[PDB]
Amino acid sequence: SMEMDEKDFAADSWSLAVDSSFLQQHKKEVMKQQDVIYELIQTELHHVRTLKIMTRLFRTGMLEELHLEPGVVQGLFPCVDELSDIHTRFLSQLLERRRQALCPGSTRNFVIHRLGDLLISQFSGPSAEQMCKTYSEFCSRHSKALKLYKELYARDKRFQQFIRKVTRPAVLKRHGVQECILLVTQRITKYPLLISRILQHSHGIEEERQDLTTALGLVKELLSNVDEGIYQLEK
Amino acid sequence: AIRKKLVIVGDGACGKTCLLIVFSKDQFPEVYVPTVFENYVADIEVDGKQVELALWDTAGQEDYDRLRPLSYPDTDVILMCFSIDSPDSLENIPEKWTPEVKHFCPNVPIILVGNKKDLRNDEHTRRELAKMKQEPVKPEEGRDMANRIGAFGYMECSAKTKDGVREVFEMATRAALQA
Numbered sequence: 001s002m003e004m005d006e007k008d009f010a011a012d013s014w015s016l017a018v019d020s021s022f023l024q025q026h027k028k029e030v031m032k033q034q035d036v037i038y039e040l041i042q043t044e045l046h047h048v049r050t051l052k053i054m055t056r057l058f059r060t061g062m063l064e065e066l067h068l069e070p071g072v073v074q075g076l077f078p079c080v081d082e083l084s085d086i087h088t089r090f091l092s093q094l095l096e097r098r099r100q101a102l103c104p105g106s107t108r109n110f111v112i113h114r115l116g117d118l119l120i121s122q123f124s125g126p127s128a129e130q131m132c133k134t135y136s137e138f139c140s141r142h143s144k145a146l147k148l149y150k151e152l153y154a155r156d157k158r159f160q161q162f163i164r165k166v167t168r169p170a171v172l173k174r175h176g177v178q179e180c181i182l183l184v185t186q187r188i189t190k191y192p193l194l195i196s197r198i199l200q201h202s203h204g205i206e207e208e209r210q211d212l213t214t215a216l217g218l219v220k221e222l223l224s225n226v227d228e229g230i231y232q233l234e235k
Numbered sequence: 236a237i238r239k240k241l242v243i244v245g246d247g248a249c250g251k252t253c254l255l256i257v258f259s260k261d262q263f264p265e266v267y268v269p270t271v272f273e274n275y276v277a278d279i280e281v282d283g284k285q286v287e288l289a290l291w292d293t294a295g296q297e298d299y300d301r302l303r304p305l306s307y308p309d310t311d312v313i314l315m316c317f318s319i320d321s322p323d324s325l326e327n328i329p330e331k332w333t334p335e336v337k338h339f340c341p342n343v344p345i346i347l348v349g350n351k352k353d354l355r356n357d358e359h360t361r362r363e364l365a366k367m368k369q370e371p372v373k374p375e376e377g378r379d380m381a382n383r384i385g386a387f388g389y390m391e392c393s394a395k396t397k398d399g400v401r402e403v404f405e406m407a408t409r410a411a412l413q414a
C-alpha cells in the first residue's frame with residue numbers, strides 16, 4: 001500500500017476522515033451512507049494489501065531466497081497473481097470515484113453519490129465470470145495450501161527461518177501465511193454485508209437504490225456459484 | 236507466547252461481529268460501528284500465561300455450506316454464539332451448529348455464549364417477543380443448552396454495555412490452552 005491511500009483511509013470512519021466543518025454541512029443519512037461506503041473502500045484497500053504481502057513478501061521472498069520448486073510455491077499461494085490483478089483494478093475504480101467526488105481545494109472532503117454502477121460492472125459479465133472461476137479455484141486449493149505450509153514449517157529449517165524473519169515486523173502481526181489465505185477466502189462473503197448496509201441508507205435517489213439492489217443480487221449470485229464450484233484438494 | 240485460534244459461530248444477528256469489535260477495540264465504538272470484522276491477533280495474559288489469540292468470524296458465511304468450513308482448520312476454541320432476545324437462535328444451536336462444529340472440529344472446546352443480555356430488561360424487546368408467545372432466553376435455558384450439547388461452559392455478555400466481554404475471551408484462552 002502507498003502512504004497517500006493509507007492516510008486517506010487512516011481514520012476510523014468517513015465522519016472522522018473529512019473536516020468537521022464539512023461534516024456539519026451534511027444530513028445525518030448522508031453521513032451514515034458515506035460511512036459504509038468508506039468502509040467498503042477501506043476494507044478493499046486492506047484486501048489488496050493482503051494480496052501484495054502474499055505476492056511480494058511471501059511468494060517472491062521464497063523464490064529469491066529458498067531452494068523450493070516453483071510448484072511448491074504455486075501450492076502455497078494459488079491464484080494470488082490473478083486475485084491481485086482483479087482486486088487492484090477494483091480498488092483503482094473505487095479510489096478514482098472518491099477522487100472525482102472531492103471538493104475542489106480539498107484532499108479529504110468528499111461525498112460519493114453513485115456507487116452502484118461500479119458494483120454492477122464488477123459483479124457482472126466477464127469480470128464476474130473471471131472472479132467466480134478464480135475464487136472457486138482458490139477456495140478448492142485453500143486446504144492443500146494450509147497443509148503444504150505446515151509440512152514445510154515442520155520439516156525444512158531454512159523455510160522456518162524465512163517465515164520467522166519476514167513475519168517479525170509489528171505490521172505483519174495478523175498477516176501470516178495462513179492468516180492471509182483465510183483473509184482472502186472470507187473477503188467475498190463481506191460484500192453482501194457491506195452492500196446491504198449501503199443500500200439501507202441510499203433510498204434518496206431511486207436510480208441509486210435500484211443499482212445497489214441489482215449489485216446486491218449479483219454478489220449473492222456470484223457467491224452461490226463460487227460455493228457450488230468448490231471441491232477440496234489434498235496432496 | 237503461544238499462538239491459539241478462536242472462531243465464532245452462530246446465526247446472522249446473534250451479535251458475533253459486535254462482540255469481536257468491542258473486544259478488539261476495548262470499548263464500544265463511539266462514532267461508527269463497522270459492518271465487518273477482518274481478523275485480530277490479541278495478546279492475552281490469563282492465569283500467568285501470555286497467549287496470542289487469533290480472532291475470526293463466520294459472518295457472511297451462514298448460507299454457504301462449502302465456503303464456511305474453510306474457517307475451521309486449526310481451531311483451538313469455538314464460541315457458539317446465540318442472541319438472548321432471539322429464542323429461535325437458541326433452537327438452532329443443537330441441530331444446526333453443534334453437528335457441524337463437532338464434524339469439522341472434533342475435540343475442540345466450545346463455549347456457549349449468550350449475547351445481548353442487556354435486552355433482558357428492554358421493554359421493546361419483551362413487547363415484540365410477547366406478540367410471538369415468547370420471552371427472552373432465561374439464564375437456566377442457556378445452561379440447559381450448554382449441558383445438552385456438551386459445551387465446555389456457558390457465559391453471558393453484552394457487547395453494547397461491554398459487560399462480560401473480557402471474561403469470555405479470557406475463558407476462551409484458558410479452554411484453548413487445555414490439551
Ligand SMILES: *CC(=O)Nc1cccc(N2CCCC2=O)c1
Pocket residue numbers: 019021022025102103104105106109
Ligand atoms: C468542497 C469543500 O471542501 N467544502 C468545505 C467544507 C468545509 C470547510 C471547507 N474549507 C474552508 C477553507 C478550506 C476548506 O477546505 C470547505
